[PDB]
Amino acid sequence: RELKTVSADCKKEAIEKCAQWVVRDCRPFSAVSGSGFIDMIKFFIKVGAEYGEHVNVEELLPSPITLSRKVTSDAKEKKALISREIKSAVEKDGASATIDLWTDNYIKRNFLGVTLHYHENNELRDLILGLKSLDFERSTAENIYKKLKAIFSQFNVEDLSSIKFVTDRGANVVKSLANNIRINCSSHLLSNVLENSFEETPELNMPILACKNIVKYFKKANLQHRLRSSLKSECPTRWNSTYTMLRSILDNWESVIQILSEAGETQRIVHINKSIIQTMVNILDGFERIFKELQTCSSPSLCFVVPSILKVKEICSPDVGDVADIAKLKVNIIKNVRIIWEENLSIWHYTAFFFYPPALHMQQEKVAQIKEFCLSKMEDLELIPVCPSDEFEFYRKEIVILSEDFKVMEWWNLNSKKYPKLSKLALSLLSIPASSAASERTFSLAGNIITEKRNRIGQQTVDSLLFLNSFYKNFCK
Amino acid sequence: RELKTVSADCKKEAIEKCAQWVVRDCRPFSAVSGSGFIDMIKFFIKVGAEYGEHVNVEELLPSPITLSRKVTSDAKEKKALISREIKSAVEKDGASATIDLWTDNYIKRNFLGVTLHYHENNELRDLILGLKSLDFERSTAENIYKKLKAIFSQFNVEDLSSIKFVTDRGANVVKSLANNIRINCSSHLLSNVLENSFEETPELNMPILACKNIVKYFKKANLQHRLRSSLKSECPTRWNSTYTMLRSILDNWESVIQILSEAGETQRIVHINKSIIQTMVNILDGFERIFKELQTCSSPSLCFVVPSILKVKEICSPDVGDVADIAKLKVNIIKNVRIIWEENLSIWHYTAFFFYPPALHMQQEKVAQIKEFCLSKMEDLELINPVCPSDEFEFYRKEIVILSEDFKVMEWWNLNSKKYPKLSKLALSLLSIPASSAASERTFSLAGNIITEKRNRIGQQTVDSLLFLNSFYKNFCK
DNA sequence: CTTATCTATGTGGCTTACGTTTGCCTGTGGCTTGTTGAAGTTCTCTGGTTCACGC
DNA sequence: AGAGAACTTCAACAAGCCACAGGCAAACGTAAGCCACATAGATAAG
DNA sequence: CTTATCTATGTGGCTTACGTTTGCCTGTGGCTTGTTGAAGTTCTCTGGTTCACGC
DNA sequence: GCGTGAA
DNA sequence: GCGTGAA
DNA sequence: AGAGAACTTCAACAAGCCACAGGCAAACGTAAGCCACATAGATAAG
């Protein structure tokens, strides 16, 4: 507890040793602040105090290959230990995950991501199961099924017949998971809505093309030296990158116009209207709020499904203060909103919104369908006073205040006492996100791991590293 | 001095914890064998055993920004410390410096790597001087000149008159260097000779084109996956990638034809001629021998180019076995060598190869000019700082030394200071000059590994600091 | 070649009783670099790569 | 929504040097009168 | 009531010498085992690119 | 067979 | 001017 | 030329298990004086 106050010159010698290390081994400066590195040096100063200053350091330091094999063996031991907990959790139906293919931009080997997302007391749990390849075989949906079955067999998972997943609209994904709960990634759907709505309004692509050409000129001509803000990727099939593109354009219009006048290429920008730009900034910022709200995975976000649709309707509500292109765009967007949402929504979505504590909005005829579905959804938890009919009207009667920082975590966790059995229904309902951000963040972790520097890695070791990092992020204080 | 050892179980928890550390922060496995890593371990165990095992790490460990600040300070500190050593080294002319531009992969900044190769006592030191980005300046000869003047100013060098330079034939590079020594990088000259000979022989395009398309479609369908050994780069301006890919195709030919027949792509391979491929393999690997000899810069090589000239002109010796393709290629090679590369040779090189202990090589009129060159040149070194140079010339030319391939002529000059001290000083001035500028390429390799995707927001000053300090540690620390 | 008891002398000695002698450590001041600690900013990117799908 | 990683920007503390004078605090000088045990001589039996 | 000394006794610690029995102490010289570890192969790369340059 | 778009 | 052309 | 980084192979070799021979100080029963204390008892006087 009471730690030592160092003599200052000792601290200078320490920093000199560390600095000569990092300079002579090209290491990043953040390695000095590693979570485990303070621990490891603690262990080494401990053993040095035990033994002194004249040990056989270079001999007693293990060889890297030994580290690899030890990591593999520890992976086996830890997965064996946690298989029991996995089975115990999965038996009670409270599970979720995301499944997605991955590919490396170095060796071009395709993979399949297997993970887990479930609920623990007053917290969300995400365990990365495993990431595996399919050799160069035709990555058909049955191959995906075989691989997932193998991975679940690795952790003694065999039933997997009542697990809930939020996925994309991939045809092989749809067919493979058609055997069980398949739910669409809402952010994917809303994005596709946005691009389809912009593609049915051609009067916007011309300003879009002009802005893209300006950004291309900015990038290739190597003149961002004056530019205070660097521009973004044009269109790498990325989410909302267009919004940031146009936002940076609205921010840097000044510098853009003076530098174009100085370069003699202002002729490619006179044909864009700035008021349209700012109005789209407001509207697309509203949907940016909607995406960021829906994209919450460290916290459930499925309770705001229909009211998000109402938000979209209000922000895109018809108005007369719009020029012909703006009004036509609003009509096209609301059309796409219709054609997508009342068709790819589910009664699961309605029940998820039904738990929303302001129960005055889902008062329509859908009460029949949610009560119809929940009745069949009420028996299974028991198969897996305070009568269901009375509890239904009691939970729909409650009036709950919306503080501006009100959250999905704690309200129901504290409301669990009045609700004895539907509470676990909610908890399973809360472990499922509104989108598939687990896959993308795991692929971020993978891409950080696998680099050009490490092309000769063994995929099994990659699985070990990924799962053990997940475990450490999960089961450490 | 006798190092105590711990129980095996102790090292077992040690390896367990090291595995934890590696897996937690995604660091490479090889980092555990860091040279400074062991220094860290020893220093930490010493400090722990000294002050007790209840130390306050949470401030003992400096912030990374403090690391950067300390490195930046130490860069100026150490360059200041060694500036006088630099001046002492360069004063006696026993040195050779090379520079070249560079560009990263993300921001595309201009650069100028400054490298210096000079001779120490029985070792040739290659010190990496500096690297300043050219920002967004137009790369005029004035900009290059001003940058080099500033770079030498940080070393307090403004003489920069007798020093020897090896570069390519870059037009702007030549223009900025139109006022002092310039030696053409022989590696680029040879590569250009080969490329220009091959382009002047369209009848050799069809085998090259066929192999290139084979590689491109092996990449395209990823059917290199069944191949155990892959193919090399298509055409990103790579040294002798053509050799490597064609010889790899020869080595993998059996599986290649098997897969092409299986996939129905054997209809496009019927146009290959493998005997010509084998002949090219033999001859171009012969060339790669000279390539690697030239690339060897840790050893003096300025006295091994004319014999390489003899070897190449022997390689193209006329014969009835050369097909019209081979005959045309060999004619192009000899013509290109004669009318470009033989022309672009230097009097410095002629004198440097004159020092070959079997001096029987240039018994021709090549000696007519050297006496003008040597006597005038070494009349200045005597002022820069009985065994007369005139009789010293015949002293050296009379002796003949056997060619024992196990010998090192390094020690031969390092010992010939006994009788020919001034001339051996001329040799060491000559032989501190590598024949190729690929040292700059190792520097660019180190730089490319320094700057990464995740280190974009890096200080160019800091990058120069790191490169210089690692170079100095390699040069001064074992 | 003792062996004992008295009968004057006579100086340590010592436990207080007390008065100096450093003296050290230690309270307050007053800077002086000197890190340095957030504190945002700004990018990299992860954010899609070859097939099930009805038609 | 992550995640790594480096970068200005304040601008905000803070350990680390002196200057030094004020105690209480350990230890050394006289003195000091009651002891009081140590130091020499007769003296009876012989 | 004591005070001294011889006189007739025991008589069991005791203390060395003798033999007898013992509860293990290294060493044994054969039996398993992670683990540097020396040789590899196999990379993905650097193999810098906009002013020169003049008839 | 046909996108195909959804990644 | 004009076109490689040295990497 | 050089990079920095994971695999792959025999491998042998220095840690731990094992546990029949050969060996040793420790413990016990015995026997020889033995011999130095220990006991009363008397014997004179006072």
Q: Is B276:B326 a contact under the CB 8 Å cutoff?
A: yes
Task: Report the 3 state secondary structure along chain A.
Answer: CCCECCCHHHHHHHHHHHHHHHHHCCCCHHHHHCHHHHHHHHHHHHHHHHHCCCECHHHHCCCHHHHHHHHHHHHHHHHHHHHHHHHHHHHCCCCEECCEEEECCCCCCEEEEEEEEEEECCEEEEEEEEEEEECECCCCHHHHHHHHHHHHHHCCCCCCCCCEEEECCCHHHHHHHCCCEEEECHHHHHHHHHHHHHHCCHHHHHHHHHHHHHHHHHHHCCCCCCCCCCCCCCCCCCCCHHHHHHHHHHHHHHHHHHHHHHHCCHHHCCCCCHHHHHHHHHHHHHHHHHHHHHCCCCCCCHHHHHHHHHHHHHHCCCCCCCCHHHHHHHHHHHHHHHHHHHHHCCHHHHHHHHCCCCCCCCCCCHHHHHHHHHHHHHHHHHHCCCCHHHHHHHHHHCCCCCCCCCCHHHHHHHCCCCCCCHHHHHHHHHCCCCCCHHHHHHHHHHHHHCCHHHCCCCHHHHHHHHHHHHHHHHCCC
Name which of B36, B51, B53 is nearest A46 (Cβ-Cβ). Answer: B53
B39·A51 Cβ contact <8 A: no
Sheet holding B183-184, edge to edge: B123-131, B113-120, B95-100, B164-167, B183-184
The DSSP code for B4 is B
Q: Which of B367, B273, B368 is nearest to B325 (CA)?
A: B273
B112 CA to G2 C1', in Å? 30
User: How far is residue B31 CA from its own chain's centroid?
Assistant: 26
Phi (first) and psi of residue A125, to 5 degrees: -120, 130
Residue B463: closest CA among B166, B36, B107: B107
Token pair listed for B291: 């390539």
Cβ-defined contact of B36 to A17 (cutoff 8 Å) = yes
| Strand E proximal residues, B:298-317, Cβ < 7 Å | none
Question: CB of B17 within 8 A of CB of A43?
Answer: yes
Contacting residues of A for B111, CB less than 8 Å apart: none
Q: Is the CB of A30 under 7 A from strand D?
A: yes
Which chain A residues have a beta carbon less than 8 Å from that of B2? 54
A39 marked among binding-site residues: no
Please state the φ and ψ torsions of residue B4, each to the nearest 5 degrees.
-70, 150
Half-sphere exposure of B178 (CA within 13 A, CB side): 7
Say yes or no: Cβ of A184 under 7 A from any atom of strand F: yes
CA distances from A88 to A114, A118, A153, A232, B211 (A): 19, 12, 15, 47, 59
The DSSP letter of residue B204 is G
A295 CB below 7 A from strand D atoms: yes
Measured distance CA(B329)–CA(B348) in Å, rounded = 30
* Structural tokens at position A293: 């709200």
Which tokens belong to A378? Answer: 């009420």
Q: Give the chain B residue nearest A26 (alpha carbons).
A: B450
Taking an 8 Å cut-off on Cβ atoms, the answer to whether A38 and B18 are in contact is no
Q: Is B361 exposed, middle or buried (0-12, 13-18, 19+ CB in 10 A)?
A: middle
For B136, name the nearest residue in chain A, comparing CA atoms only: A225
Q: Which two tokens stand for residue A130?
A: 């495993």
- Asked whether the beta carbons of residue A48 and residue B49 sit closer than 8 angstroms, the reply is yes
Query: β-strands A164-167, B95-100: how paired?
Result: unpaired
The H or E element containing residue B165 is: strand B164-167
Contact between B3 and A59 under an 8 Å Cβ cutoff? The reply is: yes
Give chain B residues 179-238 with Cβ within 7 A of strand E.
188, 228-230, 232, 236-238
Q: Technique behind this structure? A: cryo-EM
Nearest to A70 among B15, B24, B466 (CB): B15
Angle, CA of B330, B332 and B335, to the nearest 5°: 105
Chains A & B: contacts with CB separation below 8 Å: 244
Of A34, A207, A179, A201, the C-alpha closest to A99 is A179
Chain B residues in contact with A62 (beta carbon < 8 A): 11, 14-15, 18, 32
What is the Cα–Cα distance from B13 to B7, expressed in whole angstroms? 10
Q: Is B96 exposed, middle or buried (0-12, 13-18, 19+ CB in 10 A)?
A: buried
**Those residues with Cβ within 8 angstroms of residue A343's Cβ, 6 or more apart along the chain or in another chain:** none
How far apart CA B89 and CA B157 sit, in angstroms, is 11
CB contact under 8 Å between B24 and A31, yes or no, is: no
Q: How far apart are CA B202 and CA A132, in angstroms?
A: 48
Interface test with A, best of B6, B16, B29, B446 (most A CBs within 10 A): B29
Of residues A10, A15, A36, the one with CA closest to residue B49 = A10
In this structure, are residues B15 and A69 in contact, taking their beta carbons and an 8 Å threshold?
Answer: no
* List of A residues 404-443 with CB within 7 A of strand D: 437, 440-442
* Other CB atoms within 10 A of residue B213 CB: 13
User: Taking a contact as any Cβ pair under 8 Å apart, which residues of chain B between 1 and 60 contact chain A?
Assistant: 1-6, 10-11, 14-60
Q: Residue A458 burial by CB count (10 A; 0-12/13-18/19+): exposed, middle or buried?
A: exposed
Q: Do A35 and B24 touch (CB under 8 A)?
A: yes
Contact B45 A40 (CB under 8 A): no
- At B115 the three-state DSSP class reads strand
- Looking across all nucleic acid strands, the nucleotide with the smallest C1' to CA distance from residue B340 is G6
Please check whether residue A269 is in contact with residue A210, taking contact to mean a CB–CB distance below 8 angstroms. Answer: yes
Q: Of the candidates B23, B39, B43, which has its C-beta nearest A465's C-beta?
A: B23
Of A5, A23, A55, the CB nearest to B45: A55
- Helix axis angle for A186-199 and A205-220, nearest 10°, is 100
Q: Give chain A's length.
A: 477
- What is d(CA A416, CA A270) in angstroms, rounded to the nearest whole number? 61
Rg (chain B; Cα; Å): 27
> What is the identity of the amino acid at A241?
S
DSSP assignment of B10-31, as one string?
Answer: HHHHHHHHHHHHHHHTT--GGG
For residues B217 and A193, give the distance between their C-alpha atoms in angstroms, rounded to a whole number. 38
Strands (E), B14-162: 95-100, 113-120, 123-131
Residue B444 CA to residue B441 CA, distance in Å, equals: 5
Kindly state the tokens that stand for A68.
Answer: 């690899």
Which one, of A157, A155, A159, lies nearest residue A75 by Cα? Answer: A155
Q: How far is A407 from chain B (nearest CA, A)?
A: 31
d(CA A98, CA A153): 17
Cα–Cα distance for residue pair A298/A445, rounded to 1 Å: 16
Q: Is the CB of A47 under 7 A from strand E?
A: no
B29 touches strand H (CB under 7 A): yes
**Alpha-carbon distances of A172 from A99, A116, A149, A425, B396, rounded to whole Å:** 11, 20, 16, 29, 82
Tell the residue number behind the tokens 């303070």, with chain if given: A38
A102: which strand partners? A111
**Distance from CA(A60) to C1'(H19), angstroms, rounded:** 33
Cα separation, B252 vs B230, whole angstroms: 9
* Cross-chain CB nearest to A454 (options B1, B28, B68): B28
Distance CA A299, CA A124 (A): 7
The DSSP element (H or E) to which B183 belongs, if any, is strand B183-184
User: Residue B232 and residue B107: Cα distance in Å, rounded?
Assistant: 27
Contact A49 B52 (CB under 8 A): yes
Using CB atoms and an 8 Å cut-off, which of residues 402-431 of chain B contact chain A?
Answer: none
What angle, 0 to 180 degrees and rounded to 10, lies between the N-to-C axes of helices B460-476 and B64-91? Answer: 60
Question: Which token pair is A135?
Answer: 């050799």
Bases of chain E with protein Cβ within 7 A: 35-37, 41-53
As a whole number of angstroms, the distance between CA A221 and CA A217 comes to: 6
Whether B63 sits inside 8 A of A33 (CB atoms) is: yes
Among the listed residues A452, A451, A29, the one whose alpha carbon sits nearest the alpha carbon of residue B466: A29
Helix (H, G, I), strand (E, B) or coil at B111: coil
- In Å, what resolution does this model reach? 5.1
Query: How far, in Å, is the CA of B240 from the C1' of nucleotide H19?
Result: 69
Q: What is the DSSP letter of B337?
A: I
Q: In Å, how far from its chain's centre is CA B386?
A: 41
Tokens 């993979």, located at residue: A111
Pairing of strands A100-103, B164-167: unpaired
Q: What is the dihedral of CA B341, B343, B347, B352, to 10 degrees?
A: 30
B211 CA – E18 C1', rounded, Å: 106
Contact A325, A203 (CB under 8 A): yes
Quick check: B441 CB within 7 A of strand G?
no
**Is the Cβ pair B32, A468 closer than 8 Å?**
no
What kind and span of H or E run contains B164?
strand B164-167
Q: Which of B279, B290, B224, B286 is nearest to B250 (CA)?
A: B279
Q: Tell me how crowded residue B382 is: count the other CB atoms within 10 A of its CB.
A: 10
- How far is it, in rounded angstroms, from Cα A167 to Cα A309? 20
Q: What is the DSSP letter of B315?
A: H
Q: Give dist(CA B431, CA B419) in Å, integer.
A: 19
A213-219 LR contacts (CB < 8 Å, sep 24+) = A213/A268, A214/A249, A214/A256, A214/A260, A214/A268, A214/A269, A215/A245, A215/A249, A217/A265, A217/A268, A218/A256
Q: Is the dihedral of CA B322, B324, B329, B333 positive or negative?
A: positive
Q: Report helix, strand or coil for B184.
A: strand
Distance A451 CA to E38 C1' (A): 28
Tokens 């006022």, located at residue: B179
- Interface contact A299, partner B, CB < 8 A: no
Q: Encoding tokens for residue B173?
A: 């590079």
Do A150 and A133 contact (CB within 8 A), yes or no?
A: no
DSSP class of residue B406 equals T
Residues facing residue B128 across a β-bridge: B115
Distance from C-alpha of B20 to C-alpha of A41, rounded to nearest angstrom: 13
The span from the CA of B178 to the CA of B289, in Å, is: 33
Beta bridge partners of residue A133, listed in sequence order? A111
Give strand letter and number of the nucleotide nearest A25 (CA to C1'): H4
C-alpha span between A18 and B62 (Å, rounded): 9
At residue B351, the 3 state secondary structure works out as helix
SS3 content of chain B, % helix, strand, coil (to 5): 60, 5, 35
| Token pair for A224 | 């961002």
In the numeric block, the tokens 């969300």 are attached to: A124
Is strand H within 7 Å of residue B1 (CB)?
Answer: no
CA separation for the pair A35, B66 (Å, rounded) = 18
Are residues A432 and A117 in contact, defined by beta-carbon separation less than 8 angstroms?
yes
Query: What is the C-alpha to C-alpha distance for residues A155 and A80, in angstroms, rounded to an integer?
Result: 7
Q: Cα separation of A116 and A100, whole Å?
A: 12
Specify the DSSP class assigned to residue B55: B
Number of Cβ within 10 Å of residue A71's Cβ equals 21
- Characterise A111 by phi-psi region: left (phi > 0), alpha (psi -120 to 50), beta (else): beta
Tokens representing A281? 């900034």
Where does residue B302 rank: exposed (0-12), middle (13-18), buried (19+ CB within 10 A)?
buried
Using C1' positions and the CA of A299, the closest nucleotide is: D1
Strand pairing partners for A127? A116
Scanning the structure block, which residue is given the tokens 């040149």?
Answer: B377
Reading phi first (left if > 0) and then psi (alpha if -120 to 50, else beta), residue A8 is in alpha
Nearest CA in chain A to B465: A23
Q: Which two tokens stand for residue B302?
A: 């300025």
Residue B168 assigned ligand-binding role: yes
Cα(A255)–Cα(B243) distance, rounded to whole angstroms? 50
3-state secondary structure of B94: coil
Cβ–Cβ under 8 Å, residues A324 and A368? no
Look at chain B and count its residues: 478
How far, in Å, are A351, A393, A395, B127, B369 from residue A367 at the CA level?
A: 9, 10, 12, 80, 106
Q: Decide if A118 contacts A431 (C-beta within 8 A).
A: yes
